[PDB]
Design a protein around this ligand. Structure first.
Ligand SMILES: N#Cc1ccccc1C[C@@H](N)C(=O)N[C@H](Cc1ccc(Cl)cc1Cl)C(=O)N[C@H](CC(=O)NCCc1ccccc1)Cc1ccc(F)cc1
Ligand SMILES: N#Cc1ccccc1C[C@@H](N)C(=O)N[C@H](Cc1ccc(Cl)cc1Cl)C(=O)N[C@H](CC(=O)NCCc1ccccc1)Cc1ccc(F)cc1
Ligand SMILES: [Cl-]
Ligand SMILES: [Cl-]
Lengths: 304, 304
């Protein structure tokens, strides 16, 4: 029993982290087979960053303008290209530690593990969700750019996030591994604002089911509600509307606990209206929304 | 910026996890050089577990009674011994992935990363603290026994915990890697109760400093307090007494933020007396006590 913020084991990704240097700029890259993937703003000086023309800046670069280091071993760059906001550096050596992997672009509300890295060296791992406003509430310092987010499924690493920048509010923005930003953001050093965020309703409900699976029942009630009535309340408290697809995704948890989804929605409605009144759920004093239904199934026992 | 429950990268420990089988009993072992470390109750049947005499049970075993599997490769056991509550199995093959490592027995209040494993296969990593009552609030299912907890310092893995059992309350008990339990517990299947737990005061204070470093100041006040006056309040709210050694450990954080330790104690006193009144700190609605001063320094910027 018990319930924790749980990341995937990071070893398969640690073996892919390298350091990329262009001029005085250094950040992290991801070394898969004979290609290194990193944020394209590695080619920018501090002055370039305010308003870069990346096509202009890249045409002025050659292969020998890029330094790639794996451990204390330099990899020779033999080719380079730009794909959206990621720079690809072809190197002369295929990574012998390359895992089975895929590149995946995720939806808001999905979670992933982040391997925070500095100068090509992994320093820690944590769990994140993609917020509905396409930021993540990461933990990142200077030098973290190029750190990646991933899920693991039967020894296949699905990479879904590469870190590019911290916004004025301190949240974080980045791209899929093909260089497309999540959200409306662009890779230049200007003050960009995320849209107003919302709470991930299907995840809160998943986490309430985790609590029941762990024997925590104090918040349940005998009431139920309709989808339309619940969504009125979701709107009032800045929760994402609950869709029928999300009701269906919660099927297995509902069946393991015998609590219909719309029953749990009535408990959540009551929690939103009355607060917790000093009690906790799974050791938390607020409603947690960064566990997906998948996360709950993965971590909890298959029997309540 | 940002602040997350952050574990160490787990790769160096993943390469040491194996599966140990004795009879119908299977759990996880740790393979370092040519020795596999695992809970000694792997030699127990379900009936043996209620009241085992381990010396009696082990003398009835030979080397070929133990099956060790690393991946799909069986390791041949060539010797076995008991050290307190850990079984040591000598194998014919030294682990080529053995990291630089140490065995360390930690104090309550210290944190570590846990690599949760099933059948020798790593499934997730999370952060834990050793509670003052010598349990950990882990996330563990059947088959997790033999999972280890660790810290990493400059590529040296310090192993500090091996998982042995879940108590009736759902918290977890285990040993150092020399097989000595943390706390008063013993490895037999009886209902054992932990002592009443307390909040880790020095860690709460560390986490308040993390919040200030991240620009979160709403809880500060102009007051200060004495060590003796603070400890009166700590007693009232079931907090560990603050020692002068803990005041000293908080030195660097106090100096980076310009807030004297005893000043922060006055803020904590006010937080305990008045609650949060609906506000959050580092995204939490309760006072978090599973970040050490070291954890905060490691994760936060060196400049406020
Ligand atoms: N992670 C990360 C990271 C963090 C710090 C330094 C460096 C890095 C990595 C580094 N790589 C990077 O992200 N640097 C961007 C600048 C940048 C580079 C490159 C690109 Cl392409 C785009 C950008 Cl925006 C960066 O400094 N942002 C700051 C960070 C900041 O002051 N937070 C305060 C939050 C806060 C705290 C308390 C209270 C309220 C708020 C915010 C900002 C300011 C002006 C601006 F115009 C745009 C953004
Ligand atoms: N992790 C782990 C784990 C978890 C489940 C199954 C298996 C394992 C690993 C496995 N290895 C292991 O720990 N099994 C011990 C039994 C055991 C084996 C070997 C030794 Cl040496 C010692 C022990 Cl005690 C185990 O089943 N404990 C149960 C677990 C339980 O019912 N929690 C409910 C909490 C709860 C939930 C909701 C509300 C309130 C409370 C509690 C218990 C019951 C009777 C008793 F007498 C002693 C302990
Ligand atoms: Cl798709
Ligand atoms: Cl010591």
């Amino acid at each position: 029993s018990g319930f924790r913020k749980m990341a995937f084991p990071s070893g398969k990704v640690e073996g892919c982290m390298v350091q990329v240097t262009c001029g005085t700029t250094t950040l992290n890259g991801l070394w898969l087979d004979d290609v290194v993937y990193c944020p394209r703003h590695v080619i920018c000086t501090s002055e370039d960053m305010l308003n870069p023309n990346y096509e202009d800046l890249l045409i002025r670069k050659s292969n020998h303008n890029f330094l790639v280091q794996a451990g204390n071993v330099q990899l020779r760059v033999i080719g380079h290209s730009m794909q959206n906001c990621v720079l690809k550096l072809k190197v002369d050596t295929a990574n012998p530690k390359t895992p089975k992997y895929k590149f995946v672009r995720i939806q808001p509300g999905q979670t992933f593990s982040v391997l925070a890295c500095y100068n090509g060296s992994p320093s820690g791992v944590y769990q994140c969700a993609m917020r509905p406003n396409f930021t993540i509430k990461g933990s990142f310092l200077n030098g973290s750019c190029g750190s990646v987010g991933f899920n693991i499924d039967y020894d296949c690493v699905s990479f879904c996030y590469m870190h590019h920048m911290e916004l004025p509010t301190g949240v974080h923005a980045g791209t899929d591994l093909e260089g497309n930003f999540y959200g409306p953001f662009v890779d230049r050093q200007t003050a960009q604002a995320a849209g107003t965020d919302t709470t991930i309703t299907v995840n809160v409900l998943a986490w309430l089911y985790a609590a029941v699976i762990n024997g925590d029942r104090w918040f349940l009630n005998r009431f139920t509600t309709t989808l339309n009535d619940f969504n009125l309340v979701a709107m009032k408290y800045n929760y994402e509307p609950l869709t029928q697809d999300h009701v269906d995704i919660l099927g297995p948890l509902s069946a393991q606990t015998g609590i219909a989804v719309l029953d749990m929605c009535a408990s959540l409605k009551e929690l939103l209206q009355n607060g917790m009144n000093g009690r906790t759920i799974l050791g938390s004093a607020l409603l947690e929304d960064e566990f997906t239904p998948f996360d709950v199934v993965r971590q909890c026992s298959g029997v309540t």
